[PDB]
Curated annotation (Swiss-Prot), chain C:
Entry keywords, A to Z: Nucleus, Phosphoprotein, Repeat, Ribonucleoprotein, Ribosome biogenesis, rRNA processing, WD repeat
Any Pfam family matching the protein: WD40
CC annotations in GO: 90S preribosome; cytoplasm; nucleolus; nucleoplasm; Pwp2p-containing subcomplex of 90S preribosome; small-subunit processome
WD repeat locations: 11-51, 52-92, 93-131, 143-182, 188-222, 236-275, 278-318, 321-360, 363-402, 406-448, 449-488, 491-530, 553-592, 624-662
Note: Present with 16700 molecules/cell in log phase SD medium.
Example GO molecular function: mRNA binding
Name of this chain's protein: Periodic tryptophan protein 2
Classification lineage: Eukaryota, Fungi, Dikarya, Ascomycota, Saccharomycotina
UniProtKB/Swiss-Prot annotation, chain D:
Crosslink feature (Glycyl lysine isopeptide (Lys-Gly) (interchain with G-Cter in ubiquitin)) location: K32, K184
Quaternary structure and interacting proteins, as annotated: Component of the small ribosomal subunit (SSU). Mature yeast ribosomes consist of a small (40S) and a large (60S) subunit. The 40S small subunit contains 1 molecule of ribosomal RNA (18S rRNA) and 33 different proteins (encoded by 57 genes). The large 60S subunit contains 3 rRNA molecules (25S, 5.8S and 5S rRNA) and 46 different proteins (encoded by 81 genes).
Name the record gives this protein: Small ribosomal subunit protein uS7
GO cellular component annotations of the record: 90S preribosome; cytoplasm; cytosol; cytosolic small ribosomal subunit; ribosome
GO BP annotations listed: cytoplasmic translation; maturation of SSU-rRNA; regulation of translational fidelity; ribosomal small subunit assembly; ribosomal subunit export from nucleus; translation
Gene: RPS5
Source organism per UniProt: Saccharomyces cerevisiae (strain ATCC 204508 / S288c) (Baker's yeast)
Subcellular location: Cytoplasm
Family statement drawn from the similarity comment of this UniProt entry: Belongs to the universal ribosomal protein uS7 family.
Keywords tagged on the record: Acetylation, Cytoplasm, Isopeptide bond, Phosphoprotein, Ribonucleoprotein, Ribosomal protein, Ubl conjugation
UniProtKB/Swiss-Prot annotation, chain E:
Function: Required for the early cleavages at sites A0, A1 and A2 during 18S ribosomal pre-RNA processing.
Entry similarity comment: Belongs to the universal ribosomal protein uS4 family.
Organism: Saccharomyces cerevisiae (strain ATCC 204508 / S288c) (Baker's yeast)
Protein name (Swiss-Prot/TrEMBL): U3 small nucleolar ribonucleoprotein protein IMP3
Compartments it resides in: Nucleus, Nucleolus
Domain (S4 RNA-binding) ranges: 1-53
From Swiss-Prot, chain F:
Subunit structure: Component of a heterotrimeric complex containing IMP3, IMP4 and MPP10. Interacts with snoRNA U3. Component of the ribosomal small subunit (SSU) processome composed of at least 40 protein subunits and snoRNA U3. Interacts with the SSU processome subunits EMG1, IMP3, IMP4, KRR1, NOC4/UTP19, NOP1, RPS4A, RPS4B, RPS6A, RPS6B, RPS7A, RPS7B, RPS9A, RPS9B, RPS14A, RPS14B, UTP1-UTP18, UTP20-UTP22 and UTP25.
Function summary: Involved in nucleolar processing of pre-18S ribosomal RNA. Required for the early cleavages at sites A0, A1 and A2 during 18S ribosomal pre-RNA processing.
Subcellular location per the Swiss-Prot or TrEMBL entry: Nucleus, Nucleolus
Superkingdom of the source species: Eukaryota
Name of the protein in its database record: U3 small nucleolar RNA-associated protein MPP10
Gene: MPP10
Similarity-based family: Belongs to the MPP10 family.
Length: 64, 831, 804, 206, 60, 42
RNA sequence: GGAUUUGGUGGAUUACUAGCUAAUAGCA
């Protein structure tokens, strides 16, 4: 919090975070992991201290 | 912010933070005062052994340090402190908010420069006083007069003149009269360093662009000029050993020596201090010696000497290059990991982001040393594969220590960032080991652990595989696979029967190391981050990603205690040596002490810098912590180790805003008497009764070859209560007890003896201290047995005895109880 | 389990230094070599601090407040210790042979006689947290030209008397302004000045010299100056005045002379109150109680200490340390007392709690080698190199029998049958094992078959079989009892040094020269386990050695071993600086202990300082005693063990139990929850919950909170798993508790409820049962013995007729 | 979950037949019979019919006469081999005994698919005389378990031997038959007949 | 020779009973002279046996 | 003595009007000599 | 570029309260 200075929440990802993208106004956060996976946090600004990604996306070739 | 269990002690490993050090002389020797953050340290030039440390930390970071004979003067913010032997003697507080910048002292005058180009003069109250305290006057230099103050310098033989040096030029001020006596001509280049020469009337000036000017002040004219193109001067110093030698320090980290008489460069020392940390912050010749001290912002102090010339003649021409004499140093960046080397508190193991591993000794600074990274020659005989340019090993993420097998082979494992094998170290050799341990699964090393016997090394890979080797030979023995994610902790009990593992996948694996079988698997809600295993109690705590510490007992494999309260990720945590307390550090800049028996946080602290590591001493006396800032080690004293600590839970809301007593102290006192009917002995040593009964035979062997008591007795007799007499009877020494009993009146009507029987009869009713009461009345028969027997028929004597027998008859159950317990005890043990 | 800590040192009560009486006068502080031993006379309790110097202790003092203790060794290294906490605050070096240290009676300052320099220093405050530099200097004083013999404070904490080897005593002022008051140098003696003291009024200064002269000085007109008004002289034929102390309140002088005799005088009359002799050895130190009633004297050569009540001419305290390494040791069956034997040829019995020698036996002419108790405990047997085995009854303290070989053989090892009917000894010269009948004393037979000397011996407590070992690289099991005699030899890799035998009698452990602890099944006569121990052993390079400790083979083996009474651990010791405790069925090292850290002893350090060499050789050589453990033993009644060594009998105990070792705990279990159960009267749960947490303080609270009516109900329902802990708890609590009846009722319920379970598993419970038996023997019986005698004494005075 | 103690294939410069590696997996009598499933059905014969220590071959050169009860710890197969050799001509020849016993287990497995070691144990347990007689006339008396196992081995060996003393049937087959019948409990085995007669005679003198 | 015998003593090769003796002034009694022998891991003991070709490294 | 020090692997001690205080008492102080005599002796 | 041997010095091998001295104080 810029005004108060307290940690509202700590978002935890499965693998190391490389890139971060935010949608709207805290609506959703997409973070690129180092392992090659993408994690989406849904309404991260609404236990409460530590939250985990809700949706996880991967890419795999047909071969494997 | 104040702990009820812990208190800061001192900082280890920091010799200098970059502020120019001050040199002072006491007699023949010389001592150097070096800044360490908010504190200063004094080293002996003979040995670089610390001599004193500042008694308390200054409120603000120290900016300027000056020392003159015993006294050391320290300037911080708008206050100048005076210290003797590290003890503050007086504080000089300035009347302006402007912070002090430079400090100069000569004779009776103390001169302080503030950032606002204001010079304050203090003078001594008395000529024979030891330091100046009084405020003489204020002198301020305006922009028209000159530029910003570079330094305050006083040259010899100048009767209360201060040679003020500015970026624009030099100015002379008479402190006594407070007038500008002379203004130096403007110089094209900004002045950076000023140093009075050993000659009269010349001061050496250093500029921004590699120019050294021996400006003669008396003539107000330049004498000489040395050119150092593409360099910035940082320090100057003349040699006073009889050789006209000048040292010029540079921010590049390069120290050059010139021969003024010969106008030639004697030698250059390259890269003595890091350019990134300011190069050579300060370099000073020792007065009257061929030796020079050097320091820098790289947390290092070095010591160089000029050897005698090897030529019998023309020695001035044949000058030996200066040679490294000695030094002290530490990590150039904040330490990343710390460890306790031994069961004692003697030696520490520290690693930092400067790719360094150091051994630091709390007991004495001189004992601190850096382990070498010279690689042993491989056993096979082939060439080692590595870059020809020698480079320092990558940062140590993790480290494990054992001393069961110190001196026989490698006793250490370390893990490196972005790197697929583990390197060994030998504390006794203080050198890298001859064994390198690979994950064998294409994964980075994440966990390193030791068996207590020191014969097995355990490596945790990022891919979830565990490899077990032998340290003496460095050969793989067993390799386990449960975790599919990175394993963040491996622990083996003091036995080596059962090993526990934890990984980011959130499972905890319980294995039988001896039989190599999966004893059990436990899944936790959140991913695991770290493990600490307490071998003595066989309890281990896990740092979960949900901001909790979960304690598990390996014997039953159940979660036993869970700790909540941390508002951010837990950076580190440790078990107390007695396994009763856990102290953890988290990114919320707080240190919390948790009492496992009650499972609550008992003490909380707020650290200005997040504590990266926390480690207890095996003795438990000290707690060592590392912070995100600072190259040293913060050492704390365990106050619990000297006095009891209340175990009441700490106030969460109060802690957040800043950012049954016997139970509370973990103690209990036995009741004086559990029940009135119950027979209870005296509160004292059990040898007293033997002493009272057999005093005379004890007393015989020992040879070489109205009273208060009577007053209380009669007072009790009228009161019909002898408690006051009874209480004092317990308190007398055995010798005193005998005398009072013997001194008792033995003549008719025998009033005294009757009441004593009554007094003892009352005590026997109490059922407390009864064994004493049997002892005194035994002494009564010994001392008055003839008397009582002679007049047994007297009603008063007979009635008193009969009453006691009524009470004493009741106290026969003890005979039945004691005499029974032996029958069963003899039997159960026998048959 | 394996949480042992040094507690006290028996067998040595005084070595050197100055003994100091406590502020209350009820405790005596005696330096014992490298450590300090404190003795509580009134309470009959003793303790030795865990902190250790690197050398023997030279000077010591305790402040009048009783909070701070300062001890200095022979290198000037001073250790400041919190007396109440028994913990060390800071360690300091004066860089000189500090002769004496003494606190100011105010306690703000303390002064040390350091050579010719008197150093006055400011006492740190005990309450303040430890700092890097606690001490603060006040002044350094040098008027004397030679080293200072002793110093004295004024009762007002203002003026000092210093006596030095300059044949002069010198007075100083603590306050600079008061320098003019006292800046006098006192002269006129012939020999060294041992002491200088103030009178109670402080107007008279008394000075004593080595030759035996006492000078009384007074400030008087010949204008006023100090003068020797009176001169008294000690009339010893050859004894020199060596140490002197004065009590201003009672005007008492105690002077100890080199001849071994001291005299008590009354000043200024010089009235010889008394004169007594400690022997032919110097009486190393003398001290006075704050009352002035008790005088403490100590002799270094024989390690004597005596506390003498001159008022009653009675002896408060009197012991001596063994002037030897204690060759052997043995515990009583109850463990209340321990007997030690030395090379002097004399056997002492020591009480563990008081730390004091109750009895000694000097019949043996030569060194006593081994000592053992019978199963009953009434009897003790000892063997000596003089060639006899001597049997002792403690009840009458008589040598009731002596056994001797026909061939005049020296005996080194001994064992007594559990029945106490056969006594069997071994020799290093005979290669055979001798046997005798205790009842008649005849030599039954000489057991032969060993081709090497028998090194050590032991009988089975259960099977009654005998196990013998030798340097013949073999173990022989002898079935002496029975119609037929059979011998079972078993070979071992290397020479055997020690045997320990399991309490069950079904295995035997052996220590070999190779450094291996091998265990064998006696009935099956095959190896069942082995432990490697050579590397665990810590052995120090000797100053005389020319070969590294690592390459040394001087002692990489254990000369003594013993099992734990439970049978799960072995304690091992040898001619080395390590005591190692292993776990038998498992074969690991549970913990290792460093015997000593005194560099005065030769073998303590593995690596010796290169400075001490010169081209000539080691400066130290310009022989020293060796660190070694002669014997070790476990406490039958307590979780403790004793190790015999050169300095004395080190006793390691688990009594403090500050460690948190919970068992089967859970989240619901909490000290508050335990109290909640008690207030709810769920006594059984509260007792169970407390034992899970395993705190001594809670268990007392639950234990004493159970009403007598509910005890049998609780006892019957206690789980078997917590039966050992409660049994151990009651015994430890009972022995010093006051609730004799409460404890007994508990024992009555527990034994009746679970008597069968005790019998099924004797050895898991044996130590606890002995502790209980110790209570019902050593205190409970005596009370009723005192109770019953008075009952009979009463019956006479009423029944019988008194007349004429 | 899996544990790997072997990260390379093992090939020895000297060749080894693979059945030897299969033996490395488990110790089996003659590398052909497992001890794991063998149990003594009767409780009394336990602690004196010793089968828990596996051995490749009956030969051990153990010290089994030193003490009284040492013979208990002996493997029972070795006891049978020792009892087999007798009558002077076979004295000193333990190797022939081992060969004969190996043939006997081969025959037993052929005739009954059950593990022959269990057949041996069953025969020994069945044939142990539980009660006997002593001369005073005769009086019934109980029998100690070591006497049972010793006497059982004696009857089995003696019956098998005498049956093949002057007959075409060889020692191995007569053994296999006698142990098989004793394990069955059929009266055909000589030892069972003797045990029955002994116990009955003691019953008469009870 | 005695001097050869002396040199080996300070070099830590000789053991009387189970203890090495570095002092060349120790007297040995008629009983104890039986057991004046070498330290087990002495290089010389290897030299003695390596000569006669009876070295067994298991003992060492 | 002198032969013991020369023959001893370990250190060997040196072996050792007015009333003298018996430094050593062979028995506890508290026991009486009469209590140390058996009835047969009496 | 790799390997073998070796000389010298530095820090420890004892627990960190300033130097020098002719030392109640002077010197530096």
């Amino acid at each position: 919090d810029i005004h108060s200075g307290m940690t509202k929440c700590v978002l935890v990802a499965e693998s190391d975070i490389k890139e971060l993208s935010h949608s709207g106004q805290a609506d959703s956060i997409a973070v690129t992991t180092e392992d090659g996976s993408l994690e989406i946090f849904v309404d991260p600004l609404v236990g409460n201290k530590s939250k985990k990604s809700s949706k996880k996306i991967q890419i795999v070739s047909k071969d494997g | 912010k104040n702990s009820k269990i812990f208190s800061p002690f001192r900082i280890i490993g920091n010799v200098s933070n970059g502020v120019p050090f001050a040199t002072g002389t006491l007699g023949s020797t010389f001592y150097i005062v070096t800044c360490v953050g908010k504190t200063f340290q004094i080293y002996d030039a003979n040995t670089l052994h610390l001599l004193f440390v500042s008694e308390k930390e200054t409120p603000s970071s120290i900016v300027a340090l000056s020392a003159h004979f015993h006294y050391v003067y320290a300037a911080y913010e708008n206050k100048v402190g005076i210290y003797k032997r590290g003890i503050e003697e007086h504080l000089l507080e300035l009347e302006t908010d402007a912070n002090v910048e430079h400090l100069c002292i000569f004779g009776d005058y103390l001169c302080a420069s503030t950032d606002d180009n204001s010079i304050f003069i203090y003078k001594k109250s008395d000529p024979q006083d030891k330091y100046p305290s009084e405020f003489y006057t204020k002198l301020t230099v305006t922009e028209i007069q000159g530029g910003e103050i570079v330094s305050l310098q006083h040259l010899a033989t100048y009767l209360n003149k201060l040679t003020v040096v500015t970026k624009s030029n030099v100015l002379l001020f008479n402190v006594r009269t407070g007038k500008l006596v002379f203004t130096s001509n403007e110089f094209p280049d900004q002045i950076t360093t000023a140093e009075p020469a050993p000659v009269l009337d010349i001061i050496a000036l250093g500029t921004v662009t590699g120019e050294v000017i021996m400006f003669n002040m008396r003539k107000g004219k330049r004498i000489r000029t040395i050119k150092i193109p593409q360099s910035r001067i940082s320090s100057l110093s003349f040699r006073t050993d009889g050789s006209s030698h000048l040292s010029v320090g540079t921010s590049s980290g390069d120290l050059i020596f010139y021969d003024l008489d010969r106008r030639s460069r004697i030698h250059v020392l390259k890269n003595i201090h890091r350019e990134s940390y300011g190069g050579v912050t300060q370099a000073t010749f020792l007065n009257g010696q061929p030796i020079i001290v050097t320091s820098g912002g790289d947390n290092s102090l070095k010591e160089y000497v000029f050897d005698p010339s090897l030529s019998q003649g023309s020695g001035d021409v044949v000058v030996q290059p200066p040679r490294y004499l000695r030094s002290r140093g530490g990590h150039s960046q904040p330490p990343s990991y710390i460890a306790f080397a031994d069961s004692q508190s003697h030696f520490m193991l520290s690693a930092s982001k400067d790719r360094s591993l150091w051994s630091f000794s709390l007991r004495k600074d001189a004992q601190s040393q850096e382990m070498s990274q010279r690689l042993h020659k491989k056993q096979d005989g082939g060439r080692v594969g590595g870059s020809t340019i020698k480079s320092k090993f990558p940062e140590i993420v993790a480290l494990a220590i054992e001393n069961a097998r110190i001196g026989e082979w490698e006793n250490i494992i370390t893990a490196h960032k972005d790197e697929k094998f583990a390197r060994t170290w030998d504390m006794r050799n203080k050198r890298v080991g001859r064994w390198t341990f690979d994950t064998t699964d294409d994964g980075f090393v994440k966990s390193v652990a030791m068996s207590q016997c020191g014969n097995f090394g355990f490596i945790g890979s990022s891919n979830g595989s565990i490899t077990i080797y032998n340290m003496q030979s460095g050969i793989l023995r067993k390799k386990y696979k449960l975790h599919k994610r990175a394993v963040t902790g491996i622990s083996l009990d003091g036995m080596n029967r059962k090993m526990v593992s934890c990984g980011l996948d959130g499972i905890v694996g319980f294995y039988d190391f001896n039989k190599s079988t999966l004893l059990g698997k436990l899944k936790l809600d959140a991913p695991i981050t770290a493990m600490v295993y307490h071998r003595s109690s066989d309890l281990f705590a896990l740092a979960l990603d949900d901001l909790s510490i979960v304690v598990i007992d390996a014997v039953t494999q159940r979660v036993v205690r869970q700790l909540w309260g941390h508002s951010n990720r837990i950076t580190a945590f440790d078990f107390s040596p007695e396994g009763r307390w856990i102290v953890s550090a988290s990114l919320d800049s707080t240190i919390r002490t948790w009492d496992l028996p009650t499972g609550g946080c008992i003490d909380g602290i707020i650290v200005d810098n997040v504590a990266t590591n926390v480690k207890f001493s095996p003795n438990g006396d000290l707690l060592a912590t590392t912070h995100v800032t600072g190259n040293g080690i913060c050492i704390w004293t365990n106050r619990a180790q000297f006095k009891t600590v209340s175990t009441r839970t700490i106030d969460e809301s109060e802690f957040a805003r800043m950012a049954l007593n016997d139970i509370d102290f973990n103690t209990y006192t036995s009741l004086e008497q559990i029940d009135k009917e119950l027979l209870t002995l005296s509160i004292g040593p059990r040898s007293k009764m033997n002493t009272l009964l057999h005093l005379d035979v004890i007393r015989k062997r020992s040879k070489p070859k109205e009273s208060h008591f009577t007053k209380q007795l009669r007072e009790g007799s009228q009161s019909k209560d002898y408690s006051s007499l009874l209480a004092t009877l317990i308190n007398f020494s055995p010798a005193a007890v005998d005398l009072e009993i013997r001194s008792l009146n033995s003549f008719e009507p025998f009033d005294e003896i009757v009441w004593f029987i009554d007094a003892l009869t009352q005590g026997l009713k109490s059922n407390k201290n009864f064994e004493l009461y049997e002892t005194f009345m035994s002494l009564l028969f010994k001392a008055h047995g003839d008397v009582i027997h002679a007049n047994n028929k007297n009603q008063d004597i007979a009635s008193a005895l009969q009453n006691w027998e009524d009470v004493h008859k009741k106290e026969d159950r003890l005979d039945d109880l004691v005499k029974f317990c032996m029958g069963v005890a003899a039997f159960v043990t026998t048959a | 389990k394996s949480d042992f800590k040094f507690s006290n040192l028996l067998g040595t009560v005084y070595r050197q230094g100055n003994i100091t009486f406590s502020d209350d006068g009820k405790q005596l502080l005696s330096p014992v070599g490298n450590r300090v031993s404190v003795f509580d006379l009134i309470n009959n309790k003793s303790f030795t601090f865990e902190y250790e110097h690197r050398k023997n202790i030279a000077a010591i003092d305790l402040n009048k407040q009783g909070t701070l203790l300062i001890s200095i060794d022979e290198d000037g290294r001073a250790i400041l210790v919190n007396f109440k906490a028994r913990n060390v605050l800071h360690h300091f070096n004066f860089k000189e042979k500090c002769s004496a240290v003494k606190f100011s009676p105010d306690g703000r300052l303390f002064a040390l006689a350091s050579g010719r320099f008197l150093q006055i220093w400011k006492t740190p405050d005990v309450n303040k947290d430890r700092q890097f530099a606690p001490f603060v200097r006040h002044r350094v004083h040098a008027g004397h030209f030679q080293d200072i013999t002793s110093l004295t404070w004024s009762q007002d904490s203002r003026f000092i008397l210093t006596t030095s080897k300059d044949l002069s005593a010198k007075i100083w002022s603590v306050d600079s302004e008061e320098k003019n008051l006292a800046a006098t140098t006192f002269n006129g003696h012939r020999d060294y000045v041992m002491g200088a003291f103030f009178s109670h009024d402080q107007e008279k200064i008394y000075t004593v010299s080595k030759d035996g002269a006492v000078f009384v000085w007074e400030f008087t007109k010949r204008k006023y100056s100090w003068r020797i008004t009176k001169k008294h002289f000690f009339y010893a034929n050859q004894a020199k005045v060596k140490c002197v102390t004065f009590h201003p309140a009672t005007r008492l002088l105690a002077v100890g002379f080199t001849s071994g005799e001291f005299r008590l005088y009354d000043l200024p009359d010089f009235t010889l109150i008394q004169q007594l002799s400690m022997g032919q050895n110097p009486v190393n130190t003398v001290s006075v109680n704050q009352t002035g009633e008790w005088l403490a004297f100590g002799s270094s050569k024989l390690g004597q200490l005596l506390v003498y009540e001159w008022q009653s001419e009675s002896y408060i305290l009197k012991q001596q340390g063994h002037f030897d390494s204690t060759n052997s040791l043995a515990y009583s069956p109850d463990g209340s007392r321990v007997v030690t034997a030395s090379e002097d040829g004399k056997i002492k019995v020591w009480d563990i709690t008081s730390g004091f020698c109750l009895a000694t036996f000097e019949e043996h002419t030569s060194s006593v080698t081994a000592v053992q108790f019978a199963k009953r405990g009434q009897v003790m047997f000892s063997s000596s190199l003089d060639g006899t085995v001597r049997a002792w009854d403690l009840i009458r303290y008589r040598n009731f029998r002596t056994f001797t070989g026909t061939e005049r053989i020296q005996f080194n090892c001994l064992a007594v049958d559990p029945s106490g009917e056969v006594v069997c000894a071994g020799s290093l010269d005979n290669f055979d094992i001798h046997v005798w009948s205790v009842q008649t004393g005849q030599l039954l037979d000489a057991l032969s078959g060993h081709e090497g000397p028998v090194s050590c011996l032991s009988f089975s407590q259960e099977n009654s079989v005998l196990a013998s070992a030798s340097w013949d690289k073999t173990i022989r099991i002898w079935s002496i009892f029975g119609r037929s005699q059979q011998v079972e030899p078993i070979e071992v890799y290397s020479d055997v040094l020690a045997l320990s035998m399991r309490p069950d009698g079904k295995e035997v452990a052996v220590s070999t020269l190779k450094g291996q602890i091998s265990i064998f099944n006696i009935e099956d006569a095959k190896q069942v386990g082995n432990i490697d121990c050579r590397k665990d052993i810590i052995s120090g390079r000797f100053n005389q050695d020319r070969f590294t400790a690592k390459n040394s083979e001087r002692s990489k083996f254990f000369t003594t071993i013993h099992y734990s009474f439970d049978g799960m651990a072995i304690v091992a010791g040898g001619n080395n600086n390590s005591i190692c405790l292993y776990d038998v069925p498992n074969e690991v090292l549970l913990k290792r202990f460093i015997v000593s850290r005194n560099m005065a002893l030769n073998g303590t350090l593995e690596f010796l300082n290169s400075k001490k060499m010169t081209e000539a050789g080691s400066l130290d050589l310009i022989m020293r005693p060796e660190v070694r453990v002669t014997s070790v033993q476990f406490s039958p009644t307590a979780n403790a063990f004793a190790a015999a060594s050169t300095e004395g009998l080190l006793i390691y105990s688990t009594n403090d139990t500050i460690l948190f070792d919970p068992f089967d705990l859970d989240v619901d279990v909490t000290p508050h929850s335990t109290v909640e159960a008690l207030r709810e009267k769920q006594f059984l749960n509260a007792l169970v919950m407390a034992f899970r947490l395993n705190e001594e303080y809670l268990i007392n609270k639950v234990y004493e909170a159970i009403p007598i009516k509910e005890i049998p109900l609780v006892a019957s329902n206690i789980p078997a798993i917590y039966l050992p802990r409660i049994l151990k708890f009651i015994g430890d609590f009972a022995i010093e508790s006051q609730h004799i009846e409460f404890n007994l009722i508990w024992i009555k319920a527990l034994l009746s409820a679970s008597g069968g379970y005790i019998n099924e598993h004797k050895y898991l419970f044996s130590t606890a049962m002995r502790s209980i038996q110790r209570f019902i023997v050593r205190v409970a019986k005596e009370v009723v013995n005192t109770t019953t005698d008075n009952k009979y004494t009463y019956r006479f005075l009423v029944s019988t007729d008194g007349s004429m | 979950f899996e544990v790997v103690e072997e990260f390379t294939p093992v090939v020895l410069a000297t060749p080894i037949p693979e059945e030897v590696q299969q033996a490395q997996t488990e110790i089996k009598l003659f590398n052909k019979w497992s001890f794991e499933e063998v149990e003594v059905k009767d409780a009394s014969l336990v602690d004196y019919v010793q089968v828990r220590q596996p051995i490749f071959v009956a030969h051990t050169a153990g010290r089994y006469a030193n003490k009284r009860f040492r013979k208990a710890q002996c493997p029972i197969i070795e006891r049978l081999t020792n009892s087999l050799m007798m009558n002077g001509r076979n004295n000193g020849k333990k190797l022939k005994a081992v060969r004969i016993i190996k043939h006997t287990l081969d025959i037993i497995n052929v005739l009954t698919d059950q593990n022959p070691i269990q057949v041996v144990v069953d025969a020994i347990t069945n044939t142990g005389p539980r009660e006997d007689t002593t001369r005073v006339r005769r009086q019934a008396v109980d029998v100690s378990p070591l006497r049972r196992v010793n006497q059982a081995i004696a009857l089995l060996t003696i019956g098998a031997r005498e049956a093949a003393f002057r007959n075409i049937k060889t020692i191995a087959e007569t053994l296999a038959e006698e142990l098989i019948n004793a394990a069955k409990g059929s009266s055909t085995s000589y030892a069972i007949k003797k045990k029955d007669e002994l116990e009955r005679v003691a019953k008469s003198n009870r | 020779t005695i001097q050869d015998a002396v040199k080996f003593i300070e070099q830590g090769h000789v053991r009387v009973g189970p203890n090495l003796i570095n002092d060349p002034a120790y007297l040995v009694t008629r009983n104890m002279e039986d057991y004046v022998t070498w330290v087990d891991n002495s290089k010389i003991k290897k030299t003695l046996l390596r000569y006669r070709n009876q070295i067994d490294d298991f003992d060492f | 003595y002198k032969l013991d020090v020369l023959s001893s692997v370990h250190f060997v001690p040196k072996p050792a009007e007015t009333p003298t205080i018996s430094m050593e008492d062979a028995q506890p102080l508290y026991m009486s000599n009469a209590s140390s005599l058996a009835p047969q002796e009496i």
